[model samples]
Structures are given as C-alpha cells and as structure tokens.
Target: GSSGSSGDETIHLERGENLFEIHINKVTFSSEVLQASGDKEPVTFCTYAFYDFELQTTPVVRGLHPEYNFTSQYLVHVNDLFLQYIQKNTITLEVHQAYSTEYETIAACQLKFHEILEKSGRIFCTASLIGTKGDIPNFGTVEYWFRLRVSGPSSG
Candidate 1:
C-alpha cells in the first residue's frame, strides 16, 4: 500500500559548519571503455575529483592510483538553501586515465547519499562506476566513501 505525500522524506539542516570528506579508491573501468583506448600502450591513470554537480573540480587530486586510494577533506559553511540542495541533488566523482598520449576521463561515480545523510548525520557509501551523464555502465564498479560532518557555526 502506498501512503500519500506524507510518506515523502525531508531533511532539515541547521545553519552551521559542515565537514565533508571524500575517499576515492578502487575505480575500475568497463571493458568497452578500456579496450577502445588501445592495448598497444600502457595506461597512465590521471586525476580524480569531486563535482557538486553544482560543479567543481573545486576539489581535485593528482593521480594517486598506485595505492588505489585518495582522500580529501573540506570545511564548508552551510545555509538553509544550500542544505536543501544537498538533499535534492546528486554529486559526482570521476576517474581518468591517459590514452594516446593525452588524458581522458574513462569512468565516473555518481553519489547520492542525502537520505542517509539526513538520518545519520553522515553519509558512507561504496559508489558504483557510472557514466559522465550519470548512467550505470553495463559492467564496472568503483568503491568509495564520503563523510559529512555538521555542527553549529563558529563564534569567530
């Protein structure tokens, strides 16, 4: 049975400081995407970054692939509307590699953790490898986690 809109979930975020952290690890590529790049040359994994879909590359890190791990932390000031955006929108994380002597993005991981963020005050996830347009590929996966910490604004 389905309830009315009353069943819909909503998140209320008080204005304050939010600490956001992103961990990108174990990004694998689709056979289709990888094969096209040509087996004639070695792969050069490049940058990986997070996009708000509000859009950034505001946070990017150099190729840290040998260990298959990367981490970044941010301290952000939050407001009412911004909080709503966090719930309503999806964010992106991407993986790139060099092909034919030039760097190209081969895969992406789209993350949507709002409901969890609302309920738990944190978002932890193992993201799947998705496309630039946010579509899940036929076969491929990426593992990652993000944590959001919220608290009252600073006195200073």
Candidate 2:
C-alpha cells in the first residue's frame, strides 16, 4: 500500500548488519530502611552490566543516599556476531552490594536487555535486598536506567 517515493511510508531491509551503541545514562534508588547507613560505615553498592550475556564492561560503585545521588553516562559499542546475538537474545546488568562489614560479594539485580530496550530512552530497574547490616545496608529499593543507541549498517 506504500512505496519509498510514495511520501506516506518507507520500508527497507539489509542482508547482514552489525553495529550499535549502548549509553549508560543514570542510576537511582530509594531507601526503605529508617537508617540509610550503619553506625560505623556508609552503605555502598556496585554496578555491573553485561553485553550479549558476556562480561562486557567495568563494574562501578555507588553510594546511595540523599547527599550522594549516583548517576552516570557511559558509552559502549557492539558489532559482528555479538550484535546479532544480543539482538536475538539478551544482555544483563547487575547491581551488587556487600553482605557484611567485610564487604562480602553479595546482593545484586540481574536485568534482561529487552527490559531495558522496551523503554522511552533508558532502562529503568528496581532491586531487592542484596546486602545487610554492618556492611552495605540494604536500601530495599533501587532503580537504574540506561540508554541504547542501536546502529544501522553504516555505523559502529
């Protein structure tokens, strides 16, 4: 019912394509704990994002509190089979926190790529208890958001 020059609609397809960009924009959280921090220490959380189910980027730390609102903007690239696989499958992002005073590797939220992609311009997520007292105290509520800039056949 439409053509490229029809001035109403246009459709195009390519045989094989690879290239994309992922923009990690912001991360936010709200606390359920009456006390946002421990007596001897401040609560902290680490972030991890995966691409095509692979450990693609670096993990970062975030101190969730009224004064320290954690947010970020990072860019990542994808191409080749990895891009195809990610488009067909999923990427993952995890928010992890320490378990005790010693900062044990505990508490996290794993997110699927589609969950992030199905959004206006960013991926928003909430996390459950991934830590405890004496260490990175669990806020009981955490939210994270990021952006994905998908590339066509011309870019990488």
RMSD (Å) per prediction: 9.2, 8.4
Candidate 2 lDDT (Cα, 0 to 1): 0.41
lDDT of 2 by residue, 47-148 (tens): 444542343433344344423344443333443444355467653344444545555443444444444323323344544444433344453554445444
Error of model 2, residue 113, in angstroms: 4.2
TM-score of each: 0.54, 0.42
lDDT string, candidate 1, 1-156, tens digits: 454533223364454577666666654556664565455443444233333423333233333223445566767665454556656766655556555557666566566665554653434456566555435374366566655456556566
- Residue 33, model 2: lDDT of 38
After superposition, candidate 2 runs with Cα above 4 Å error: 1-37, 52-101, 113-120, 123-125, 130-139, 150-156
Q: How many clashing residue pairs appear in each of the predictions shown?
A: 0, 1
